Symmetry: D2
Subunit: 291 residues, 4 copies
Amino acid sequence: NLRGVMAALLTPFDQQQALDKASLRRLVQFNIQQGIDGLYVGGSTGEAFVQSLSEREQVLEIVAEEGKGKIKLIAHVGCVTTAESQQLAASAKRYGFDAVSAVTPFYYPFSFEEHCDHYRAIIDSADGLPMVVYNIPALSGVKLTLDQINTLVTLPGVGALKQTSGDLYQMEQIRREHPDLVLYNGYDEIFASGLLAGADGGIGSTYNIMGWRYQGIVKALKEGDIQTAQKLQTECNKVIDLLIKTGVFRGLKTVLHYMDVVSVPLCRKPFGPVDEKYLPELKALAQQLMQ
Amino acid sequence: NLRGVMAALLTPFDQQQALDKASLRRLVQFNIQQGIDGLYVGGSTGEAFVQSLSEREQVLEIVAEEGKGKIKLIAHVGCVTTAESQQLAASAKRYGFDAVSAVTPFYYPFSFEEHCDHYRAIIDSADGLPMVVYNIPALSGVKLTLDQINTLVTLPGVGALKQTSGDLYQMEQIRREHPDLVLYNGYDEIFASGLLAGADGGIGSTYNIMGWRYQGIVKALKEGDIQTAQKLQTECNKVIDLLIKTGVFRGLKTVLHYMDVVSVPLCRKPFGPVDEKYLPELKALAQQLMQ
Amino acid sequence: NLRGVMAALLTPFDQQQALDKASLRRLVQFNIQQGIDGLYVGGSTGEAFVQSLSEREQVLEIVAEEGKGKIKLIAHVGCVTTAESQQLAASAKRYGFDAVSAVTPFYYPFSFEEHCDHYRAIIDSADGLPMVVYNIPALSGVKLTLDQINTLVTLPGVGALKQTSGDLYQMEQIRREHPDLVLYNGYDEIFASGLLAGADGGIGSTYNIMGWRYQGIVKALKEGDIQTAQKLQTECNKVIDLLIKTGVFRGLKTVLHYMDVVSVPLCRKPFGPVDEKYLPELKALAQQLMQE
Amino acid sequence: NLRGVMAALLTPFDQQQALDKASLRRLVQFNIQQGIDGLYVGGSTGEAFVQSLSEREQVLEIVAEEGKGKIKLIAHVGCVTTAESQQLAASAKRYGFDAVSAVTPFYYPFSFEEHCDHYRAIIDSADGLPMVVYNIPALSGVKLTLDQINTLVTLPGVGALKQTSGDLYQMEQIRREHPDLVLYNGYDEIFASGLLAGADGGIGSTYNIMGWRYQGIVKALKEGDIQTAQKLQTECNKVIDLLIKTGVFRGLKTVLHYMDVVSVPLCRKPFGPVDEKYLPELKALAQQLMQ
């Protein structure tokens, strides 16, 4: 039931780098409009790690007002701190989110046992909302084994795994081991490949501007049409190429600004703005996607 | 015409740890009858790096005698030394191989130009034979960029790329850049996903014992039956889970042995033998693969 | 005036995980009486990334009170966010600290320019307090180059470099490039070698329980007594070996708790408690350090 | 008694890239006159991995012939193949080298037991020659654990360890574990620091052009003159800075060439030439060094 193509919501800031509630609302609605199955809020893409708990809760509350009941809402609640995560877990519950999620805590190296108790404590605080384990070795620096992953994924309370890893051998072993597990493909660039390996949906930042393509790839693969599946994927991939040159969060916000969704396409410092030289390609991209 | 499913051939040894030429011939034929498209000989799978050039030249000659004309023959000629490689390249030509191949020279760190000059030399000595750049970062320790991969791939005389990387975002990037390039999926564990990403064939050590499944996966994806393609990949992956436990080269040789192909399922030390506990499952798999 | 042997201050918490101010003050004074050159507060050792800005502000404020120009005071003000770092940098000035510090922002990959601007803005908000650029690749996952380090270290406002790296070739080269740079060695396990290589002092978590050994290695080398320099370092290493087994922060708090300095030997979750099995060794260690 | 500053021997090649015996002998004696405690022949610095068994043996005999009895002689006998290594170990005995040495077999991933048995076999063939374990993770791609290094170092036959690692905490840990172990500091850029951490000697390539400095640092440290000890290490690093910039093996041979020691300062391909922009720098270096 949590399966599908969920977008990792971006958080629009204003000239003062404060939250832009109006753009947030425009963004939520814009995603709904584009036929997304749900939203993963306050994740890395939402720049959670560069905002406070209150700022973080404020976003959860607003998207819940906008989207609750219309699509699935998963609140990324993870912090390095379990206590901070627990507080966020409770708010998500209070706001009516469908599930809660958390990255494997970072910076300080924690044992695998400490990782499990973290999830256990957060799940406790979720008070019912299922947990989506969030695995992104590349950013967390947390390199869990398949076994550790199997343990986490079986922790009572866990309803999904957000696999932000390009190891498609592992993607399938996870599927082979947990046939019923809601498996989200974390890297947009290999979405079609991830689904073929075992993912049954996905969460990602590029879904904010072209979510329909991912839905497309999903149908095609269902309708045994690898031609449109591959075609759709290379089209997502050309966009990802550019965003990787420009900065994905900022580049996605910039395109969004061009679709009239976001007022100021800035990210919080230390992120810098997009290089002016990249604006013609982003503008152009916004235009084509607008059609 | 180099596109297809090519077994990365194993080299049988006797109790004295010396080529079991009689089993080599038996392995060559076995592969042919299982409908393989060609053989990548003298690679990592063939324990080439624990061999002498003369040993490698001998294996080259026996398989050419065994299959020149029956299937495509690609000779892995790579050595850390350019001159040794050129020697091996020159015999491949003289023995009648269809193409030549070489790992990026390892152990010592080399600049990219050195890498390109290395391939140029080998390509020259191959005397007309198309070259197959061999990319396996996990074993070579060489971490080439995409631009570098494009440069190598476009070097005159080069006719294909053997991609032993599970980075399927890079697989498609390469493909998007080179629609005519013969791209071999190097990781058996992700074959279906690798093809979907842009690969048009594969070279793998597990093909030796169940190459038919990989061809089947090719038919399925070709026929829009991703459902049986997945099924084929998981079956291939259950095998891979086991071989990775028992040790791959030796595991395969043991299976082939129970299949009456290899007399002595040994690998040359440092490799040790399979743990006896594994024998029943390998024996079981052998009988089972006889499907 | 920032050169020296300075302890990476730990932050004591109570049974309910709240700050234990009395033990903070108690730990500040203990370090002072231990004859350390100053304190590095709010850094990795201080469990800053498991606290909130106002929590870190409180700690800075309490120790500034305690360390009233009694010793050198460095405030690790770094966060991923430049703005949060600026706020902390401004409080540090406000509390009267001697220097300001910050790790290279983590989690999200940033460009070198993004990093240089980050340090400037903070240097900007410190309003006069020098900046000790903080380099710890192992934790930040940020891999700066010598030239990137050079740029940072020459950046106006920057007055020191906290080298938490085992690469002593790079340590040598940085000293070579900057003969007067306050270079602090970050890995206590190699303190003697980092010094020989060019580090002119150090900042470490284990200084909390044996800051004198580190001060000793310094004298030992100053007087060419490399023989005792070695003995001190292996004595430090025998300790670090145990601390790594148990978990460094918690192990330290545990020793310090057995020395009646820290009331509760806990670290905030997700850090769990120390395995009972190690208590016999930690009690003994606390015994002998006190014996010394 | 293998304790000491041992120079890692370069193998001079001719214009045709063939062993330049004239220069080998010339270098053996040059090193001797430098007051070096011995020579580590046939190692990484000796381009062993780009040579053949026969060529490696040849160089072994010529050097035994040139310095056997005069200085300590450790022959690097290591290859990926245990059998090849054994053969070279057997020859070292024959030529009368003092010790044997082998890098952890690389390229293919081997188990620690496989690693152990390999050293055992080679130990068996060195016929009485104590084995020197060569740890160089950077190039080998092998990251043994301390307990693992401890096992290796205590193997019956192992007499020393060449630690090519900049982990000076592990250095002191090895010295603490084995107070009577012959521990060679492998990275010349940290010589002084390695010795202070526990190494009682060192095997380095740069020793070939200024072995006196390392012997110099040793005395200063032994005398308690860290100030000059340092002043010495900084000098070696100014050099090392350059060589890295120019390519170490090729840079060294060039400097020795300007020191009328080596005829053709060529490394074997895939390595390339020293760029011309450096010749003046290297020129200037060789002059200063000779005075």
